[PDB]
Structures are given as C-alpha cells and as structure tokens.
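Bump. Still looking for heat shock protein HSP 90-ALPHA structure tokens.
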Amino acid sequence: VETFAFQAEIAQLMSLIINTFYSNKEIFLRELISNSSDALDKIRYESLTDPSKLDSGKELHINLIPNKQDRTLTIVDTGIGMTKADLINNLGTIAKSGTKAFMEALQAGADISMIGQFGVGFYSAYLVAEKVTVITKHNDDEQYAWESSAGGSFTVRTDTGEPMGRGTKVILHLKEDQTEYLEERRIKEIVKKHSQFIGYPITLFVE
Ligand SMILES: CCCCn1c(Cc2cc(OC)c(OC)c(OC)c2)nc2c(N)ncnc21
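Sorry for the wait, here they are.
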C-alpha cells in the first residue's frame, strides 16, 4: 500500500464538493457513466488499428451494480482502463488546470452540475460517497486498486481480487443518507434523464 498526497488544488476541489450545500447530487452518475463511455470509445478507437488490444475482452459495455449489504454502487466498464502512472501522476497533472477553471467558474455563478466541462467530473463521486475505490486494468499494466476518502490523500496498491480482463470499476461507498442511489427505480430515473443516449449497453443489475 502506497499513500500519496493530492496536489493542493485537487484537495481544495474535493473539500468544496464535500462541504458545499448542493441538493442536486444525482449528477454524479452521468459523470461516471460519461467517463466509462469515453474509456470505451478510446479502446474501440485504438483497436481499429491494433485488433490485439481486444484480446483482453471484446465486449464493450457498462454495468451498474447496487449492493445494499455493502452500501455500494459500482459503475463497471470494459473500457481502456488506467495505468499506475495515470492513477498516481498523469490524471492529477491534467486535472489541475480543469480544477482551477471550475473553481473560477463557480463564481460567475456556475453550479456544481457543470463540473464535467472541466474534466474533473470524477470528483462528483464525493457528492454521494464517503469513500471511493477504483479497480482498474489497462492492457499495458497490472490490475490496481486506487482508493480515497478524501482528507488530502489517496492510496494505490496492486489488486489481488478477481482479475477483470480490462477496464475500470468505480465502487462508491455511499454516505449513510445517500442510500436512495441503491434503489432500482431511482437509478433507472437518473439514467433515463441524463444518460439515455450513451452508445454502449448499460445494464442495471438488481438485488
Ligand atoms: C480523461 C479522464 C479519464 C480518467 N478516467 C476516469 C476519471 C478519473 C479522473 C481522475 O482525475 C481527474 C482520477 O484521478 C483520481 C481517476 O482516478 C481513479 C479517474 N474514469 C475513467 C474510466 N472509467 N476509465 C478510464 N479512464 C478514466
């Protein structure tokens, strides 16, 4: 287990997402599904010139998996996945400028639902989750677990759970008062409202 500090601006963004009063929390799901969709476009595009990129799995889909016992909602994709370098350095580096612009825009009166335009919609997970665990496997790298409860740090470790082939699982450990996002009817409503044109099958698992 390696522990890392977020760059100061990302820590500030995370605290703002956790601390600001903002009732329209449901927008987290569209942000995460959109990230999965982008990741599936990416591996789809790369495989046009190198079909061996799909040896790790041909099926391109998104699964939404609620689990009331664990209080988790998991967004699964078989997209491109993320390398260790992504997880520790590169996404954070790209995210710094997006963070600064988002924070600026939040005066001029943008609101939190606009986070996705700044490339940091991932952090919207913290509207609803007290901890987020990301299991991910990229073709060029090993399977990793990233995790953070915010507070300025995150961890990364090689994952020894079940091998996933290729892609990403974002496990949202939900806040005690956010268990509505485990209900089948609430998830269907949100997907229908915000994500009904995604070009990959989205399967809502039931309990
Ligand atoms: C361009 C942003 C892409 C990074 N990313 C994201 C969003 C993301 C964004 C992050 O920082 C902006 C980040 O660092 C903490 C991260 O770590 C797990 C994930 N989701 C996926 C996904 N499902 N599959 C592939 N790449 C993804």
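The chain has one domain: 1-207.

Edit: fixed formatting.
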